[PDB]
Design a protein around this nucleic acid. Structure first.
Ligand SMILES: [Zn+2]
Ligand SMILES: [Zn+2]
Ligand SMILES: [Zn+2]
Ligand SMILES: [Zn+2]
Length: 118
DNA sequence: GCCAACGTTGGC
DNA sequence: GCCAACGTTGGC
């Protein structure tokens, strides 16, 4: 389950109080049953939750411990759009096999195992 | 514990 | 085929 980034112009904009979802909020005098965010606050690049860890080694992102961009990528968590697996690419045992990175979402790709199947 | 809100589905 | 409603997760 992804969480809003809290840093995009969408995230930092206040609730309009006039859209369909704001109108449902108790704070704006609604029943509070829809439980959805303001329609003007839809995060552009949602992030993995703080507690996300690699399926294989059980650790979180360690990309700050490495300098090079390839090394950093391998120590970062990547979530597969297809199999939903969150893993460090360096924790995978597929040599040359490359996935397909999604640039619209952070830590998002179609993993090397799925691209090969597909 | 409070509260915001993601992802999915049955009922229309 | 849509969407209100809900269970339940995530940040604080
Ligand atoms: Zn709104
Ligand atoms: Zn955002
Ligand atoms: Zn790992
Ligand atoms: Zn996959």
């Amino acid at each position: 389950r992804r969480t809003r980034c809290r840093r995009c112009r969408a995230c930092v904009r206040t609730e309009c109080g006039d859209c369909h979802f704001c109108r449902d909020m108790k704070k704006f005098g609604g029943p509070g049953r829809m439980k959805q965010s303001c329609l003007l606050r839809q995060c552009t690049a949602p992030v993995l939750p703080h507690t996300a860890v690699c399926l294989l080694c059980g650790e979180a992102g360690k990309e700050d411990t490495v300098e090079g961009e390839e090394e950093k990528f391998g120590l970062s968590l990547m979530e597969c759009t297809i199999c939903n697996e969150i893993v460090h690419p360096g924790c995978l045992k597929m040599g040359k096999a490359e996935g397909v990175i999604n640039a619209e979402i952070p830590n998002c790709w179609e993993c090397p195992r799925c691209t090969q199947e597909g």
